[PDB]
Design a protein around this ligand. Sequence first.
Ligand SMILES: CCSCCNC(=O)CCNC(=O)[C@H](O)C(C)(C)COP(=O)(O)OP(=O)(O)OC[C@H]1O[C@@H](n2cnc3c(N)ncnc32)[C@H](O)[C@@H]1OP(=O)(O)O
Ligand SMILES: N[C@@H](Cc1c[nH]c[nH+]1)C(=O)O
Ligand SMILES: [Cl-]
Length: 329
Amino acid sequence: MKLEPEAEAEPLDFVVATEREFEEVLAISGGIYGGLDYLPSRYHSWLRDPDRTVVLAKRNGGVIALESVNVIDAGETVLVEGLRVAPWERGKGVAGLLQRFCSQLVKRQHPGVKVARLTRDDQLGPRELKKYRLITKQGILLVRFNASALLAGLGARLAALRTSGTFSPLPTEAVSEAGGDVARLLLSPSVQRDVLPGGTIIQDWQPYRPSESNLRLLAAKGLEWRVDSRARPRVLTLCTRPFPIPHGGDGTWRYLNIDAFGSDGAQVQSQLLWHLQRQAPRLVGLNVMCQLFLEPQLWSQLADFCQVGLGLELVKGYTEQYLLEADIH
Ligand SMILES: CCSCCNC(=O)CCNC(=O)[C@H](O)C(C)(C)COP(=O)(O)OP(=O)(O)OC[C@H]1O[C@@H](n2cnc3c(N)ncnc32)[C@H](O)[C@@H]1OP(=O)(O)O
Ligand SMILES: N[C@@H](Cc1c[nH]c[nH+]1)C(=O)O
Ligand SMILES: [Cl-]
């Protein structure tokens, strides 16, 4: 005998999101990522993206879940982002149903897509190891500071570090995306093999294969880049413009994401400093969650630099960002 389908008194309805559901989406998003949720600041942007479909699950006419799918890598990849289920609806399989609906939508709307990708920091287990390939991983360093405090004290801390011989920042080199420097870096086969994690660009949790088509997407975001040497690149860093996050409930917090590629810890330190000096003046009067993604064996060095050297507070211990990939059949 076959298993008969279970009747549902309150079946889920899956619909494409519009601006009118923003407040309902906020209402299901309390506490996400400990206050580092980007969706409040990004939801309206998402609605404009040409290769993105933002799907809502509704029950009894009310939004209870959300997932975004976005086609990238010149049509070969769908990136899954933002997956969330209202707290009062969790533990019932809702996320599983929403993911299945979105997979069906991708198969119908984007028949050329070959794989799905996503990033996560949750501990991976045997199940994850069978559904996904691990493309790469980075360590995650999360620190917090008041920008006015950093602005007032940073110069004097650097002076003390320099005069004691403990730390002076090494020279770094300018990278102009408009001038073609980013393309020259990211399209280099040697950069791809030796600098980028698993040959991939990760920008504020979003993975991109290094290709002309993806560089266009990166170039519209207003990123800031730095490198140790354009001629012989070994450490490349990427700062995403800071954006408001709900942490703290008061509107005073911003999220500053820096992705660091390569293995020279001293250059990661110098480039981190460079980005903080670039970004802090516009953050005056605000509080900052700064999250640095870097090769795992550099985490302790950079955590010490941030805390003891720069006077920033460590928010949590070591965690990892996993880039996961599954085939679409
Ligand atoms: C791309 C974005 S990354 C970020 C993820 N987003 C967040 O951080 C936002 C906050 N978070 C949430 O919004 C919810 O917490 C989420 C995670 C969305 C879950 O939403 P939810 O609706 O509660 O999820 P459920 O479908 O019930 O989760 C079942 C899945 O956990 C495993 N699992 C373990 N124990 C189980 C059990 N007893 N029964 C069934 N599955 C079980 C299983 O592996 C399955 O997955 P699968 O095998 O794919 O079915
Ligand atoms: N896959 C997650 C990645 C993430 C961003 N911030 C924290 N985690 C998402 O799209 O929401
Ligand atoms: Cl030094």
